[PDB]
Amino acid sequence: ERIRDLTSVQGVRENSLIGYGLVVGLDGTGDQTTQTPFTTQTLNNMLSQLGITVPTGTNMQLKNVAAVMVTASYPPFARQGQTIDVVVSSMGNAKSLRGGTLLMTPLKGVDSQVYALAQGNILVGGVQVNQLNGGRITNGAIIERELPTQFGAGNTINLQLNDEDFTMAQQITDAINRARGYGSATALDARTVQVRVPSGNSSQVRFLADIQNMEVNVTPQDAKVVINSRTGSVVMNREVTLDSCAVAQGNLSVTVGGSLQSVRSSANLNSVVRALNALGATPMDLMSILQSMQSAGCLRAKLEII
Amino acid sequence: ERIRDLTSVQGVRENSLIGYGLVVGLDGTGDQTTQTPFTTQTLNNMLSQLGITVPTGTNMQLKNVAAVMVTASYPPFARQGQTIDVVVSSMGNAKSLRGGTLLMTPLKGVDSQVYALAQGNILVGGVQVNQLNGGRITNGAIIERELPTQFGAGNTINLQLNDEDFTMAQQITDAINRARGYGSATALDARTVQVRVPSGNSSQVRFLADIQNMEVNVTPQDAKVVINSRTGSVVMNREVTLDSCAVAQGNLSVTVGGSLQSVRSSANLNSVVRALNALGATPMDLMSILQSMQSAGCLRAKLEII
Amino acid sequence: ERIRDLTSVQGVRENSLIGYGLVVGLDGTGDQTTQTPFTTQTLNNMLSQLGITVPTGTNMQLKNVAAVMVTASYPPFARQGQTIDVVVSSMGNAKSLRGGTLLMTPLKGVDSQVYALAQGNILVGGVQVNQLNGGRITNGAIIERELPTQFGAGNTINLQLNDEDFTMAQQITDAINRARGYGSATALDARTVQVRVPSGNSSQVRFLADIQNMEVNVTPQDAKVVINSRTGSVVMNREVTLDSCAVAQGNLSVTVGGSLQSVRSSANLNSVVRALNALGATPMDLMSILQSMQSAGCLRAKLEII
Amino acid sequence: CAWIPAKPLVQGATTAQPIPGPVPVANGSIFQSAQPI
């Protein structure tokens, strides 16, 4: 496993940008302006800015426009001239945004500053129907501001690990030290590894490029089981082991001779899967069985509901 | 991979232009002037400018015109006499813009300055029906203003990388240095490469032309999975690897003997695809399975919802 | 590729002319004067100018006339006696303009100056019905004013490139220098090439005539994909390349064995097309697949929604 | 008399000048804390 696949750099970080905008076209299916006052008000503001002042008292019952919120991911080291993808979601009661156009919406950060400008054409999917009130614009937003960064300054860079682990951090530090000079890396906690790099943006970039593609083996993480209970999904880690026990569940019985099926001790995932399958049950019954088993022991893993 | 395909120049940048206009013709299907007051007001303004003053109190119930918004992409280094394509989208309640004509709409930037003039004939597509409230005009807009630029001044040019990467920046810098003189390029961050070029517009243009077509190999980017959840699409990178695990999903069972199918460890994309297919499920079930797997580990990639 | 096919001269430029007029005849199907007050008012103005003063209070309910807007393209170097084609579009509620006649409408520029006079017979096309509210008049407009130009003055002429490109500008400059004397051309940016020409209108015309027909090879432009999403069209450049990946889309599965079809790496357009076709899907599904792929990488091209 | 000096019960300034706040830290995040109390 590569360092880039399981670690992130301290200075590299994404930000969230949000903005309000209007979508035109739509062949009808737009917002009902009677129930969406902000749509008409924003359209009037745009018209007044462009040079048209509609009288305050007017009908303004249009159906080819929809008020939308546009969300974007400000990427790390964003440049002024670069472009990013945006997601446009209907705000009022618009039926669909099939072939709409997003018009010059300013994308701002949490500080209320305009960081991008988004404009373009929405693309939406054409019984599992697609979401017609939410679309994506590729390269629809152009950056306007650049976030200052400290990258290239100092002599220490922090590699941050997803799903922190003391063994994982130790392995990363050992790999970095073996590849680079002695004492190049030092683990600060279960999630942070401080690496010494020479001063200078170019030198730091070269060091990070060398480190990121480094190959590090992944030690056994933990015996973990995930139960959705909302999508009807159950997933077990390769480290899950099952202790000998007897389980009785409603309508479940020995194939053959009745209830109270025996569960043999299983050390590996294959044995655990075979024993659970022999204890024949649907995933919904399996969730309850696993919960009861973990409550009573007999399950050498931690199970979480997602 | 060419430098032009994965990098953009600092000075080269597009801008967004928006404007309001009217479309005539349409064989009916135009805006309902009763519910679209701005259409009649703008038509009256145009008539008064042309020399016809309609009395304020009049019916003015027309159906051959539609108020539209026109959007254009101001290209880099735009010249005064050049032409650009525009997109016209209905604003009010117009049924269609099949054979309409856009009449002399000024396209302005975010600074409220007129940067182009758009006029021409709309082209729209003639059960998947086409969008009849939005059309495109090719070469419909003529530029009027030219944006000042610094290109040709200074001695440093910044190449900006899409989907920043330290390894990618290092590769680009190494390729530029190998092709050109020693020290020609230097990576400033994961997304920016500063290249030294001689003073002068012609010299800079020649250097950029030489650099852009340069061939640079693309290193493994990252193990990334994209789930739409709105268009029912799942895409996996070539770097995605699957860890051994057992997954149980509603209505899914071993072909054969029941639920809790085993997923063998897979290092390459082919093995991952074969294992997931053996765990037979539709894309919608696959999305939930992937989410649960990533939550529980067993999936050496980052998955994002788009 | 000829220089004329991919470049435009600085002094050569088109302008847009707009005007208001009336169309007579039509065998009925004209504007409803009750709902189109400007039609009757303009007809009364014309009658008064001709010498007939209709009383202000009168019915004037006619159906053989329609108020129209006429648009024309003022060509570069327009002469006083020359004629241009015009487009006539219905303004009010006229049903059709099948055999109408446009009567002496003045075509004015953005400066409110009369630049042409348009008069003639409209030609309109006689389930895909033709547009009967919009017609074209060939040579229907006669120019009246001539725009002053600087052509023939100075010693430098700027060739402007459509779809600017540093490589394209360098190629054009190299071709011009090779054909003409040393240093005849110099690229100023990605879109402008300054060419030195002798003083004098005749000499400049001869130089431009020699340059325009010059043959210049077109280098690979860029890996670009265009998705309409409104006309259901997808177009890929010859430079588009596909990276190895796995894609799962709703209702799509391996021919054969299920979802999650593999996409082999393809370097050329033929391989990309064959792989995408093997991943059998309609264009609407292909648009979503391409969007997801580009989001996840695996697509070495920039895709834009049109 | 009404001209005798008097002190209004609401003593002190009736205005507060807003503080500009803390300068952002170039940590790469748009979000900036505000010294939690």
UniProtKB/Swiss-Prot annotation, chains A, B, C:
Keywords: Bacterial flagellum, Periplasm, Signal. It holds the Pfam family FlgI. GO terms for molecular function: structural molecule activity. It is found in: Periplasm; Bacterial flagellum basal body. Assembles around the rod to form the L-ring and probably protects the motor/basal body from shearing forces during rotation. PANTHER family: FLAGELLAR P-RING PERIPLASMIC PROTEIN FLGI, FLAGELLAR P-RING PROTEIN. The basal body constitutes a major portion of the flagellar organelle and consists of four rings (L,P,S, and M) mounted on a central rod. Belongs to the FlgI family. This is Flagellar P-ring protein. It comes from Salmonella typhimurium (strain LT2 / SGSC1412 / ATCC 700720). The gene is flgI.
Swiss-Prot record, chain D:
The basal body constitutes a major portion of the flagellar organelle and consists of four rings (L,P,S, and M) mounted on a central rod. It is found in: Cell outer membrane; Bacterial flagellum basal body. Transmembrane segments: none annotated. Assembles around the rod to form the L-ring and probably protects the motor/basal body from shearing forces during rotation. Belongs to the FlgH family. A lipid is attached at residue 1 (S-diacylglycerol cysteine). A lipid is attached at residue 1 (N-palmitoyl cysteine). This is Flagellar L-ring protein.
